[PDB]
Structure 1
Amino acid sequence: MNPPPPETSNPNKPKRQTNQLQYLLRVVLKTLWKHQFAWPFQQPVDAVKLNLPDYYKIIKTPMDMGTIKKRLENNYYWNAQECIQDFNTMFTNCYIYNKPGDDIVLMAEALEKLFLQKINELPT
């Protein structure tokens, strides 16, 4: 089966709204979300549907833009670096499970370059 998805709320984790975190939701995520290659990354990997039964044997810290989106909307993060780390976990998972040249990797490679472009400059 699929594992439980990552948490999107945690009452005992301190929350914070920063200008940078508002920007990561309004501009960075919500623009990557519209990319033609974004769809595989908008929800946790459904290893059952995709017939990838070894996915969660290999990936032990799953992450996806659907989870990141809910975390941003729920003010789950303390700072932008926490959210950026989640993006990097998602890309890294993709490169770990898959191989250079795979369709999914070409998609992640493209999103990651766009992600890096958008976060090169954050609001102050």
Structure 2
Amino acid sequence: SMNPPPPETSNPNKPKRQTNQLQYLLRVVLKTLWKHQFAWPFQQPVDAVKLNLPDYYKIIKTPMDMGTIKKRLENNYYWNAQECIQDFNTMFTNCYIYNKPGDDIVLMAEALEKLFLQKINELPTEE
């Protein structure tokens, strides 16, 4: 029923890059999803205490959220675009695993995921 430590957003010994694809993931993908009317449940780690989800972290062993992704992008945590894309996919998958089809939160995730897919489709070629 307690919250775990959040995913890390800083690891000085992890090697880092700033690439055109990563810049797109921040400026286009993250920013598009972040401003959406359905972003709010996904803007920070799930607070299982506040939300009264005592079993959340019993079920979800790889938590991810856009607050974490935003910090990772802004603090140049990633080596490549695939790591960040995987984080978005983890976030969506967790929501579908934990919740029931058609729940409000599932519809919200699906709307954000549709936009995510559209933007990833135009991921720029590595420069």
Q: TM-score, normalised by structure 1?
A: 0.98
Percent sequence identity is: 100
1:122 and 1:92 map into 2 onto residues whose CA distance is 21
2:30 and 2:44 map into 1 onto residues whose CA distance is 13
Q: Secondary structure at the match of 1:62?
A: coil
TM superposition shift of 1:120:
0.4
Q: What whole-Å deviation, never above 9, does each CA across 1:91-113 have from its counterpart, x for those lacking one?
A: 00000000111000000011101
Q: Secondary structure at the match of 1:2?
A: coil
2:85 and 2:124 map into 1 onto residues whose CA distance is 14
2:72 and 2:29 map into 1 onto residues whose CA distance is 14
Q: What whole-Å deviation, never above 9, does each CA across 1:72-106 have from its counterpart, x for those lacking one?
A: 00100001011000000000000000011100000
Q: TM-score, normalised by structure 2?
A: 0.96
1:1-124 to structure 2, matched below 5 A, reads: 1-124=2-125
Unaligned runs of 5+ in 2: none
TM superposition shift of 1:123:
2.0
The number of residues matched between the two structures is: 124
TM superposition shift of 1:42:
0.3
2:112 and 2:8 map into 1 onto residues whose CA distance is 23
TM superposition shift of 1:27:
1.0
2:16 and 2:9 map into 1 onto residues whose CA distance is 12
1:102 and 1:109 map into 2 onto residues whose CA distance is 11
RMSD, matched Cα: 0.6
Give 4+ residue runs of structure 1 displaced > 6 Å after superposition.
none
TM superposition shift of 1:122:
1.5
1:123 and 1:102 map into 2 onto residues whose CA distance is 34
